[PDB]
Symmetry: C3
């Protein structure tokens, strides 16, 4: 009744959320390749000083990439959203 | 019944996920502006070598931005949440 | 019906953890980026930094991830309760 309408709508909304999370993941992973190429550029420019972090006398930041979790999780979600 | 409580809970949880997806979108878009300005900086620094990617001798990485889909879908989702809570309250 | 609510539950849990994973990753990347930035500010120090040398308004990171952290934490709580 009103029940079915709501259940259908939730299904739709979960799929929209899956899609947005997956879109964010590709965007984030793409950007990360830009960022790491930038880093390689800076280690080149700072070659005589030991590289970027050595030049800054800072602890070196690395990209801790947790997006495998996202891809595996969202793929499982898409598979289950074939239940209605 | 218990069903009413659960309408309420799901509305809450979807709204929370919507808000969180949007916050992340805004943060990622903002970060990308920093990143691309960094890139222009490196392209200037390596201007004589034909740019960053040329100097690195690398295929050039570009930001595949899908955040437009995200901004659209989440606006739609807020609209739906609001419309459903409005009808329910009616 | 219990089967339905279980399916929704699992789906919401998957989304929560995925959002949280993205959050950890974005926050980590952002540190790499900011450090890159500090690097470019040193390379352009006499010209007033990167932005001045590009003749541009400066981009800064508007970090909204605290909202994501707080909000997902509560979602995990409400999900675990049920
Ligand atoms: Cl960067």
């Amino acid at each position: 009744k009103q029940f079915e309408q709501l259940q259908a709508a939730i299904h739709t909304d979960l799929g929209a959320l899956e899609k947005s999370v997956s879109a964010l993941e590709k965007s984030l992973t793409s950007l990360s390749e830009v960022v790491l190429q930038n880093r390689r550029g800076l280690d080149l420019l700072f070659l005589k000083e030991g590289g970027l972090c050595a030049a800054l006398k800072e602890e070196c930041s690395f990209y801790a990439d947790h997006t495998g979790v996202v891809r595996d999780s969202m793929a499982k979600l898409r598979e289950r959203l074939n239940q209605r």
